[PDB]
A and B are shown apart, each in its own frame.
Chain A
Amino acid sequence: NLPTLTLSGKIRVTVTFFLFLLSTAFNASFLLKLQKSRMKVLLKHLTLANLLETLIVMPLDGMWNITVQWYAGEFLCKVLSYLKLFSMYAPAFMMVVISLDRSLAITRPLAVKSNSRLGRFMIGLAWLLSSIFAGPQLYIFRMIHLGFSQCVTHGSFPQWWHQAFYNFFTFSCLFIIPLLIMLICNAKIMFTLTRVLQNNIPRARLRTLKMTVAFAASFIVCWTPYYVLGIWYWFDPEMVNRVSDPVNHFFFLFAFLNPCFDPLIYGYFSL
């Protein structure tokens, strides 16, 4: 009934702390490698954003899980629920920016490289859009009592229609749209390479196909289970009473793999 620390939770928070440590170590090593070019700038900023998420969200998620109930303060919860979604948006926008930069470099090399403003324009706009679209969390989230404690969106949104609308908006800005633009950008890269073919062009074509499929697979694997449970709850809120405790616990552990996977995949498929 009242959410407590069942067996499915101690393991969850232990694994969450383990993933925190692994993500921090991996991204620190990747930053050390990158410090020692435009691609370098974008990759370094992406790894820094992944550090921001790993150091903000995973400790937050673990703290709620191991230490159930959230009473630290309405304002504190509101700022933390801003920082969470902000650090969540940042990697996706950075991925989109990287894909756009690659597409502009390959498809239109002569003209794209002529403007150095885009080196700062896109990196600035990624953070700016993250901050601007991550705000709405401030007004909804808040500390809620009744005498259980937890920080929930109940009441802020008049109807479940509005909850579905906001959830779908964040879903689109998080998962569907960044993946679609990465796929489209790499598709245009492959189309341009094919037109050129129609020495090293075949090798680059193979590596771009590998990179597209690898990033798609990693992103999908990470954010499929998360949003499967999310959509189940979203359309049929009763699933929690349709109790499945390990289900409710262990699927949202994967979405923190994306901060872990980004350094590895980018380091292997780039440098």
Chain B
Amino acid sequence: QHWSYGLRPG
């Protein structure tokens, strides 16, 4: 995920 997937380890 080059985006931010919430506060998750993207």
Smallest distance from the beta carbon of B9 to chain A beta carbons, Å?
A: 4
Contact residues on B (Cβ < 8 Å of other chain), bracket? 10 to 19
Main secondary structure of the interface of A (DSSP, over half): helix
Smallest distance from the beta carbon of A220 to chain B beta carbons, Å?
A: 18
Main secondary structure of the interface of B (DSSP, over half): loop
Query: B10 — which chain A residues lie within 8 A by C-beta?
Result: 61, 64
Say yes or no: B2 contacts A3, CB within 8 Å. no
Point out the residue from B3, B6, B7, B9 that lies within 8 Å of A167, measured CB to CB: B3
Query: B5 — which chain A residues lie within 8 A by C-beta?
Result: 233, 240, 248
Smallest distance from the beta carbon of B5 to chain A beta carbons, Å?
A: 6
Q: Chain A: how many interface residues by the 8 Å CB criterion?
A: 27
Say yes or no: B9 contacts A230, CB within 8 Å. no
Interface residues of A in 1-29 (CB under 8 A from B): 2-3, 9
**In this complex, what residue of B is CB-closest to A85?**
B2
CA distance A153 to B8 in the complex (A): 12
Say yes or no: B9 contacts A240, CB within 8 Å. no
Say yes or no: B6 contacts A3, CB within 8 Å. yes
CA distance A68 to B2 in the complex (A): 16
Say yes or no: A240 contacts B8, CB within 8 Å. yes
Residue-by-residue, is A138-154 near B (CB-CB < 8 Å gives 1, otherwise 0)?
00010000001011111
List 29 A-B pairs, Cβ < 8 Å. A3-B7, A3-B9, A9-B9, A61-B9, A61-B10, A64-B10, A65-B9, A70-B9, A85-B2, A88-B2, A141-B4, A148-B7, A150-B7, A150-B8, A150-B9, A151-B4, A152-B4, A152-B7, A153-B3, A153-B4, A170-B2, A230-B1, A233-B3, A233-B5, A234-B3, A240-B5, A240-B6, A248-B8, A252-B1
Q: Using a CB–CB distance below 8 Å, which chain A residues touch chain B? A: 2-3, 9, 61, 64-65, 68, 70, 84-85, 88, 141, 148, 150-154, 167, 170, 226, 230, 233-234, 240, 248, 252
